[PDB]
Amino acid sequence: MDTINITLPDGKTLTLTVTPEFTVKELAEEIARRLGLSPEDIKLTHNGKTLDPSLTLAEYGITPGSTITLEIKKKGGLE
Incomplete structure (x- = not known):
């Protein structure tokens, strides 16, 4: 196995x-590039x-082949 799954x-x-x-x-930076997000949040x-x-x-x-x-993390406001 060489591929992995990310849910x-x-x-x-x-x-x-x-x-x-x-x-x-x-x-993390590789997979985040395709979703349009930053590694510091994921x-x-x-x-x-x-x-x-x-x-x-x-x-x-x-190891490869694992789940x-x-x-x-999302932020809305103060309260």
């Missing part, structure tokens, strides 16, 4: 390729734990 709040899924040389920040969550952009994908122990869910 967004819209309900659809996207297919991207992952490598041990790619970082969490790099992989957070990757796996097994209940979140992934940091400073670390690597091979440090967390992630990943992303989340985004």
Whole structure:
């Protein structure tokens, strides 16, 4: 396996390729470019734990062919 699935709040899924040389920040900027968003707002969550952009994908122990869910934070006003 070399492809991964990413489930967004819209309900659809996207297919991207992952490598041990790619970082969490790099992989996030690639997928975000197609959706028109910023990497500083999207957070990757796996097994209940979140992934940091400073670390690597091979440090967390992630493999291709797994299910990943992303989340985004929205702001309206003060109250």
